[PDB]
Design a binder for this molecule. Structure first.
Ligand code: FAD
Ligand code: FAD
Lengths: 490, 485
């Protein structure tokens, strides 16, 4: 009957996921993926945001920044290393890209092998069960399928001020930028902002951060402030309550010099500075407005852009589904989108009845001092249950590996939120410290089995591991006791 | 009725000091005895216990130096302009290590002081009911009495019983303070301690060799163990299987000297010889329960092994004497567990608590060049408890994103979980071999305290890009028999 059994628009995380999973159950599948260039004209291969301008690139650069310190710790452990080592940006970028490349080509083969058709083209709906695929050279083509998957994902959002698109770079441009961005400026307080401000500073670049309001909106604010405080204390510069209003090229080059003017958010004050680069990280917009959603009947939320869907990842149009960052009121993370896409393909062609659960999803913001969390924030939690039925156990901690180099003591920190009405159930987990991601995974798994404080205490901790601090948490926030060492060094 | 103290603790160690403090917190008169008998080579250390002085701490820390070496090589491909090979100054490391333990020593001291607990740097020995004889360092003695006692003496490195050992060989106790690059080293044994040390020693450059009687990590998942060895073998360390030394002769003394080690195979009667700069023994530890006067008071210990039997309340056969820690019979020989037992006892005793310390499913990690943490049943011991037909094994390989750029050891790391099919595919065993293994495990161990199941695990979303996430999507089983390369 139709051309294909399933067509996937967007070769992204949840894209390629459902693709392979659907292909696995002998269906005819076609994935179309096309990457519209960035204002400065940046392009990249198959894979998605995570692979080319997200997780992968982000985390790796974070690595180079962490290795930086490791070089500086290595000294006290006895390694004869120079007081200050230098860093070659062009060598780094290159390496990073070389890997993304392999990831690209890998995914390609991955589709080939699973007998899935990949078309490097932009897709838009023209009418029921029909889609318009436009390639790079311009030549179009039409296809039809019994069902459709929207996995287009979003893109970096700009300010709408003089000079941005023209002189500023975004997360897309960065991971491939070909020059020491030199003194940089990061406009925004997002995880992306912070992690990037984060590794750049960690490579030695002079870094400044411009914040409209709060840090990490949506995250435990207490944890956030701490991240900031750590950020400030280790080099990063912060300007609070200031949005830029114009970016002016004082000279072009690799890099150039630029003047950024900004207007405070609470007064008439205006300030000016010149930096070598300016990256904007103030949000990202769903790529749902230019695909033909009218010509097929999809109701999205024209206001925000996200797509409302059902617990089966189904739109309002029974043969058109959407999974990923584009969904309305969900979780914008790769492993999530992949579970959705995988689970869908199963729900659909395998008789599965399992729905991708979006409750209590773990995360990790890769700031200089990582911070992973799972479950409710302190605030959100209190709000849901009421300050009297919620207790918070917290503590600081110092990583054994940090004693010898003798740095940052009483800087790492942990806390869990419990619901006294429900057997002191662990509703929220929060840790700030190294390798926080590794530390969090499993506790998330614990939440899926209803961990409780009694049960947590019953656990014995590993020693000496950062993660063990959760097994022995005796101090409550409400009791009001203090949390510090009777030595205070670091 | 009426005694000197309310509670006496023999042994100022992990569980010792733990119980000391928790009890003092409930207004009891406590006294802690801790004394360190020298090693044959004559080394001694401060308050604290094995962990702090010749164990966890020094061990991990040196592991760190070993790991930082790697970091120094990785840093290259990430953009840091460093030399092709950097040099490591042992003396300087040892020093750093020692300087931290001190603070730990003195910290505990103060810790007790402020908590109003009495501490005497003396050897304790029971002389009769509710009475103990504390001999100090210069030999002066003194007698104390208490309504209850706590044994927390823990073990010590065991020796072979062959010519040359106590006289030319070192143990874990001697190592972490050795005042000289051990040079070509030989580590006799295949215990975590053995491999761990052999591991970092090899990691800072030293020519390392390991001699094994039989298998590696007896007691551990043998599959996991092999992978640890095969990995150690792959990154420097040299092994010699089925051979125990029979004599160690001094070819010359020095800092360090040269020594000959003569060994006899176990499968034949062949005999080999080699000379190394030092020779460390990691063949076992023997509880210190033989010389404290346990006869004089009524304590029955298992004279065979050394451990002490006790109830599910860490109570001995004598109602007023309790024991916690490495010296217990059939339990768990790790620091956190001892600390829990001590803490929980004090509470069960003097605070009306009724909580028992659970020893089932205790997480642990071995800090070999390639960390390995595990929780619960091994595969073998697992099968053996439920039967090959009721146990399914999911496992995967994985490659840490941080390893990609430096381009190394791909398909070395490895995960694995054991489920009991007859019980909602419950997770009965967790095993991971990869970096930051401990961090990764901790939480899963807490998952087990809540009966995590494979359905539930699958319903968990992973963190990206984190090593840990590998356990959120395990599709392959060992029984199905597909591949993972
Ligand atoms: C800087 C940064 C760092 C991040 N770090 C992390 C992290 O560490 N961990 C984490 O879990 N998540 C991270 N994320 C989020 C993660 O990248 C996304 O959640 C994930 O990539 C979304 O998967 P997706 O398929 O829904 O969207 P995508 O991965 O972006 O897939 C979308 C693809 O579809 C293509 N496409 C769009 N429209 C069309 C069309 N009309 N026709 C054809 N093709 C089209 C696009 O070109 C794109 O390549 C990060 C994001 C950013 C920006
Ligand atoms: C190399 C090594 C590495 C280890 N690594 C780890 C690890 O990473 N994680 C982990 O959890 N565990 C580890 N352990 C085990 C851990 O050290 C023990 O489980 C823990 O120290 C036991 O606590 P304890 O109080 O029962 O024994 P101890 O800590 O040894 O306390 C015993 C103290 O009592 C003193 N004492 C003995 N007899 C007398 C006496 N008659 N009078 C007065 N004082 C006395 C001793 O001198 C000693 O200082 C390691 C052990 C070694 C050897």
């Amino acid at each position: 009957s139709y051309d294909y059994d399933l067509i996937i628009i967007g070769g992204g995380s949840g894209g390629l996921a459902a693709a392979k999973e659907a292909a696995q159950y002998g269906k005819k599948v076609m994935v179309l993926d096309f990457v519209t260039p960035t204002p400065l004209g940046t392009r990249w291969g198959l894979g998605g945001t995570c692979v080319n301008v997200g997780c992968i690139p982000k985390k790796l650069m974070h690595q180079a920044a962490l290795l930086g310190q490791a070089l500086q710790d290595s000294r006290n452990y006895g390694w004869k290393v120079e007081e200050t080592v230098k860093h070659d940006w062009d060598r780094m970028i290159e390496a990073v890209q070389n890997h993304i490349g392999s990831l690209n080509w890998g995914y390609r083969v991955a589709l080939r092998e699973k007998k899935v058709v990949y078309e490097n083209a932009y897709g838009q709906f023209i009418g029921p069960h029909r889609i318009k695929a436009t390639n790079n050279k311009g030549k179009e083509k039409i296809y039809s399928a019994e069902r459709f998957l929207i996995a287009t994902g979003e893109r970096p959002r700009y300010l709408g001020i003089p000079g941005d698109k023209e002189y500023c770079i975004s997360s897309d441009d960065l991971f491939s930028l070909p020059y020491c961005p030199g003194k940089t400026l990061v406009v925004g307080a997002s995880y992306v902002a912070l992690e990037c401000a984060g590794f750049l500073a960690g490579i030695g670049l002079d870094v400044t951060v411009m914040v409209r309001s709060i840090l990490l909106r949506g995250f435990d604010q207490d944890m956030a402030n701490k991240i900031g405080e750590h950020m400030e204390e280790h080099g990063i510069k912060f300007i609070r309550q200031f949005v830029p209003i114009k970016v002016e090229q004082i000279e072009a080059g690799t890099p150039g010099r630029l003047r950024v003017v900004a207007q405070s958010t609470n007064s008439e004050e205006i300030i000016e500075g010149e930096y070598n680069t300016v990256m904007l990280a103030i949000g990202r917009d769903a790529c749902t407005r230019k695909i033909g959603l009218e010509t097929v009947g999809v109701k999205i939320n024209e206001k925000t852009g996200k797509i409302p869907v059902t617990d089966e990842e189904q739109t309002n149009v029974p043969y058109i589904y959407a999974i990923g960052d584009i969904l309305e009121d969900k979780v914008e993370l790769t492993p999530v989108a992949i579970q959705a896409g995988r689970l869908l393909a199963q729900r659909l062609y395998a008789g599965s009845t399992v729905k991708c659960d979006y409750e209590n999803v773990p995360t990790t913001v890769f700031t200089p001092l990582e911070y992973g969390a799972c479950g409710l924030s302190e605030e959100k939690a209190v709000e849901k249950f009421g300050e009297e039925n919620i207790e918070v156990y917290h503590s600081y901690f110092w990583p054994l590996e940090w004693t010898i180099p003798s740095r940052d003591n009483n800087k790492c920190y942990a806390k869990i939120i419990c619901n006294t009405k429900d057997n002191e159930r662990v509703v929220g987990f929060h840790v700030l410290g190294p390798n926080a991601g590794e530390v969090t995974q499993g506790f998330a798994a614990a939440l899926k089995c209803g961990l409780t404080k009694k049960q947590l205490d019953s656990t014995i901790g590993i020693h000496p591991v950062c993660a063990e601090v959760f097994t022995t948490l005796s101090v409550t926030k409400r009791s009001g006791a203090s949390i510090l060492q009777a030595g205070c060094c670091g």
